[PDB]
Amino acid sequence: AHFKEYQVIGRRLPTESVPEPKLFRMRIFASNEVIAKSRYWYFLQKLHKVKKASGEIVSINQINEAHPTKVKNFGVWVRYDSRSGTHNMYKEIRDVSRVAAVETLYQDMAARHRARFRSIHILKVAEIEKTADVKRQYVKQFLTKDLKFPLPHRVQKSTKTFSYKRPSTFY
Amino acid sequence: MRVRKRQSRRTSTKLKEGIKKKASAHRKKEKKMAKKDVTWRDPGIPSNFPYKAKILEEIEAKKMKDLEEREL
Amino acid sequence: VEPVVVIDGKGHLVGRLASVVAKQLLNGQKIVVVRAEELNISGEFFRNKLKYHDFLRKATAFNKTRGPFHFRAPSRIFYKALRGMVSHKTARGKAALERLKVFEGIPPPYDKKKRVVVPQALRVLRLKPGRKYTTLGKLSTSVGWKYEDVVAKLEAKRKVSSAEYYAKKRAFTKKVASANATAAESDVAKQLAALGY
Amino acid sequence: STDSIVKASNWRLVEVGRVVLIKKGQSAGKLAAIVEIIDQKKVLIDGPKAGVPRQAINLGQVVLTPLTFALPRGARTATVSKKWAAAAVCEKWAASSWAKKIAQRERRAALTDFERFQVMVLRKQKRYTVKKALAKA
Amino acid sequence: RSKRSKLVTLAQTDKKGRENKERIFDEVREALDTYRYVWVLHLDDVRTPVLQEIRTSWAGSKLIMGKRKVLQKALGEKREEEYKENLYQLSKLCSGVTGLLFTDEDVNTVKEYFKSYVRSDYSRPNTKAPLTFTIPEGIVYSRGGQIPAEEDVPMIHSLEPTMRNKFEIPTKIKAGKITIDSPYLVCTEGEKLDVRQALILKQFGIAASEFKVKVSAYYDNDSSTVESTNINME
Amino acid sequence: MKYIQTEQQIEVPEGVTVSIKSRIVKVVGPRGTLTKNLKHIDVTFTKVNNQLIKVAVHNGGRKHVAALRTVKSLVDNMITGVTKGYKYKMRYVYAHFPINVNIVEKDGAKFIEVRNFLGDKKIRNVPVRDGVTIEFSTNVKDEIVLSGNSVEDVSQNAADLQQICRVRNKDIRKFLDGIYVSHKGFITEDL
RNA sequence: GGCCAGCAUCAGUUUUGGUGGCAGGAUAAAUCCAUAGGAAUGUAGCUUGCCUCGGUAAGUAUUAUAGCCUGUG
RNA sequence: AGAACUGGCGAUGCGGGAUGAACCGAACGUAGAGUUAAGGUGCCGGAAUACACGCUCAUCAGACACCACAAAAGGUGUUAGUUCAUCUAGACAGCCGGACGGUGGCCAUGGAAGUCGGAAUCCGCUAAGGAGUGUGUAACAACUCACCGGCCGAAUGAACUA
RNA sequence: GCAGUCAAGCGUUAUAGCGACAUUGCUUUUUGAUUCGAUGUCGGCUCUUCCUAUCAUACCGAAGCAGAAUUCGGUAA
RNA sequence: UUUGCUCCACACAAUAUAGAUGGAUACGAAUAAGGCGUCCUUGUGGCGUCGCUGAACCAUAGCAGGCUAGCAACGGUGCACUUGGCGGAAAGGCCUUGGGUGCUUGCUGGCGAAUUGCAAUGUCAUUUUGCGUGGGGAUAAAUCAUUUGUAUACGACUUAGA
Ligand SMILES: [Mg+2]
Ligand SMILES: [Mg+2]
Ligand SMILES: [Mg+2]
Ligand SMILES: [Mg+2]
Ligand SMILES: [Mg+2]
């Protein structure tokens, strides 16, 4: 759905003579907190030898975009499940929010790579500070000074079955 | 300009059910072969990522800290 | 909203036009379609000619006069597309199909009537630029229709007469607009402008 | 007359400073300014005078107007409002027949039954005058 | 997809990398310290035997060729990057196929040799025509009338497509011999030549132009000055 | 990739006027006028001055930009045709039967008539396309010259003349008779 | 009093609108204001090359006769 | 194919999968109202020619059972990626010039000079130039490219993956 | 077919194991010499149509294709 | 086949069933372009303006629309005649001259409405194979039977006969 970003902090259950277990924090993109905690436990089991029944969730907090109304360039480092193994992939998305960039990336992976949410792993979303570090042409073509482009062949939506004039596609 | 006969695309029930049975047999044979075979069983940072130097410096700092974390 | 809706078939896509016309006929609207030879089918001319030749292949083996009947006229091709979307073997389907007339060109009395278009079926609004499309008159001539030249000549004569009519109408409209503009400063005009008219 | 001539075919351009009219959503019927271009299909718009929030929007939800004013790229809400007030976009918009047509449509929708009767009477009077004038010429 | 496919050839020689340019750079910068006079020579369209004869004549000195940009970088592009004082003028005076002559011999001797050195050469395009060449009517011979036809061998039949198409000369094959219907004028004396006429003259073997080395200037190590020679720069 | 905008330039010399409206290009020069219909390609023409005309594609792909370059080449060829012309020289050769090439008038149509090709009794006829002129070269043996402002028309006429004399059922290593395009160039030879 | 209906006030089930008061989060993030730094897809100003009476092509210049970004409050 | 266990069907209608012994929903008194399941909403046909991001043009696409044809084979179709390289002391193409000397290296042949063959395949001068990549000659000649340079000026090539 | 060889890939940090394209040996040796068990369903006459996986006729491409003739291949029922 | 047949006006009469209930309101062409207005040196011309839906335009007040008194203007509109032109794709329609005869809500007045009882489509629009009135217009053919054989199983076909 419309993605949100959470931080999930968890730990192992405290045992005898081993108090204050180490706290581990992850940034998860998910539609709701149930999915966020599920993804957190999945990745924690995949990385460390901690299970859901053996650990606990200490905190889960939604992180909002710092400047949601500023146009930004994001470099997205991801990897996807394959038979040969994990394969890295780097994408560049121009958007105003990390969650919007993540949603765009998931739609792109579904459209092109035929990939799914549980197969795509989000490793890093990083804002590109300087425009000289952008290295994809489909993003760089929108960084040109005084960029103007038209929208030829405008198609207007009709609310009636029949029209009494030949339509025009001017704009 | 003589057009030939076109192959039909209407689904046959008997063919579909036979394909289902053939697929189940194939899956069982694949599972058996995967259990029976004797065959021996981390790409890292992509080169197009901008902050590769930052990632490498962070992992070097983590290694340097964790080398002494367990020692003392 | 009209008792009879006359559709100028030029520039329309045949399947979408057939869909909307069939729905209108089943809902109970009387429809007349003109200029069926100017209809369009998306895809290349040889693709659509290949499809029509597959249709021509279809025929009853023991008696060809019993089999599918391959009507070559563009209006008949459009009628085939429409009958494929109307359940024509029932009384309701027959009653719906008897509310439809299709013609090549614009014969009288429809040559002096208002003609409308269907935006959801227009090629310039639906097809992406660069996509190929076929003209139904050329397809019909290629598959056996023999009246493309007569239709063209009659349409040219009708266009000459219609152009003369429109020149007279435009002159009268300019005169009417000039007569209406000189009363724009009257108090009645000011009150109508305040009321939105 | 030995000069080349090429038709122009003027298009409204997606650019910083282009004034757009929102046709669907929460802010339907209001004006906004294109602050920054995001990509081929989305832009960043700001509508501080009419109350339109600064937002990323799809170009399929707005219609480009012929009006355009000077505005720096990525301008914040205060700068956009200041430039909008200086350029007087609202007055130039209201001067156009497009906004006049919208206003006429809204007034006709707001008319009552008695006002429709008055419209009929005034239309008959104007029709009598216009027909008498047109009979002579 | 839909891209040009590179031709693959199985030869013995590989392309030179950055190491060759660095070696040339180091050799130039060492010769600058070793020798006293550095001369700038223009040697466009030089033949390798002529260049080797010049190298043999200038025994005890060094002649270095290569990329003009590499040589200029070795000499120093600007005043803050020059390898020696007042070397930017010598670097900026270089042009085209430039050779650097590191030597210790007398300036008068160098100027005398480069003024008195002259060799016959093929006539290059964009140059004044050295003679008027007319292929005579009839059977085309290898020299094209420069030597008598009784001494000359007829032109080989394999060159007829080349003369007909590339050289745009109306030729026919009669009994395995190249023939023309009318005499063919190729060039008029005192006219700028193009690639086709230069190729025709080269094919017939006429070498009437003269090759002379151009001398731009020289730099003196102790004097730290540059003086323009202006030899064969007419 | 869907490039935002891709453009090409067309340079117009001093004596040439180009008028374009709804993708109908008219090019006028000293040698005459040419007309082209480019309504099958979605491009936008723009004039920046009397010496340069740009043609552009907005938000297009590989096929669209290839068509853009093709359009630039076609307009350049029209300008070249009206300012210099096109001249194709062909030679006809034979071994035993001399090929006879003449200009004949059948109902005012200007056919090129070819006779005695490999001893054939058939009379071959190639119509002359409108706008091209046929000349038999002086002081050059068995040479035809086709001149005109349309490179397409001149080249197609030359190709038709070449293909009307195909050798059938014979070894072409041995039988060398035919009419072949020998040179292509411009009518004007000022420099 | 037999047949068919209309309206009003209720009861049970349900469907579709308008509007009010509260509570949580980074006690939303934003916007806005103030303040300190910064750079270019470099605003004003200046210099040169020569350009249709100054419109530009390239250097300088961090707010100026436009602005923007980040941190803090 | 042989064993263990568990589900469905025969004895069972209803909705959907166009149609159906084992597929997807759901089991059944007679009715009214509401909401749904599975499956769907261009027309046949009740229900958005809805909204949004991408991909694809097939000289019989596809709207399928995920088994086979199927070699993850072939393609100068298209898109997105991965890893190596080259690069203003000059990216890819293009044009022009150079492409040398011992030497016509030895044997062999009527002839064989880099280019019919058999074995060596070196040295010098270079910016670079094979005891030669091909065309060509009876042998030579001539052209070419391996390689280098001049002009041009900004990105480009290769191999894999989807 | 059986047995073996090579290695573009696959697999791996234990030069194990799979493995495309190629290739060898037997069948099968050198001078163009000199019929062997269908255990249960076959063929006609008259007459129509269909497939193309084309023998001929039509048009093409290649080949030491001179001509003549022929071979291989393409579109085509 | 007890005056049959057909239209022209006037009465009475019944009638209007895939679904009237203000009006189906006429350029062509393009859509990476157009429409309208204006000007000139008439074009692939210059200048201005319009689109972003018909949410329009025209019509629309009066016992389902009555009876009368004026004012202003010489307009609008219905009907029966009348003058002329055009339209053959299935024209059966479009424009137009003249007088006559009604209405006019362009503006100002005076009378009438009731009880259909608080709603019940509450019936309103062309054609009329029916009659009566009447002024005019015109007085056939086919088949069976007989006959021919250019035809034929029978029907049919093709001939002939006041
Ligand atoms: Mg209730
Ligand atoms: Mg429906
Ligand atoms: Mg098969
Ligand atoms: Mg075949
Ligand atoms: Mg009244």
Short mmCIF file of C-alpha atoms (C1' of nucleotides) in Angstrom, two decimals, chain G residues 4-6, chain J residues 118-120:
data_model
loop_
_atom_site.label_atom_id
_atom_site.label_comp_id
_atom_site.label_asym_id
_atom_site.label_seq_id
_atom_site.Cartn_x
_atom_site.Cartn_y
_atom_site.Cartn_z
"C1'" C G 4 -56.51 -0.39 -3.16
"C1'" A G 5 -53.81 3.66 -1.42
"C1'" G G 6 -51.49 8.68 0.84
"C1'" C J 118 -54.66 16.57 0.67
"C1'" A J 119 -52.02 12.54 -4.67
"C1'" A J 120 -53.91 8.73 -8.15
#
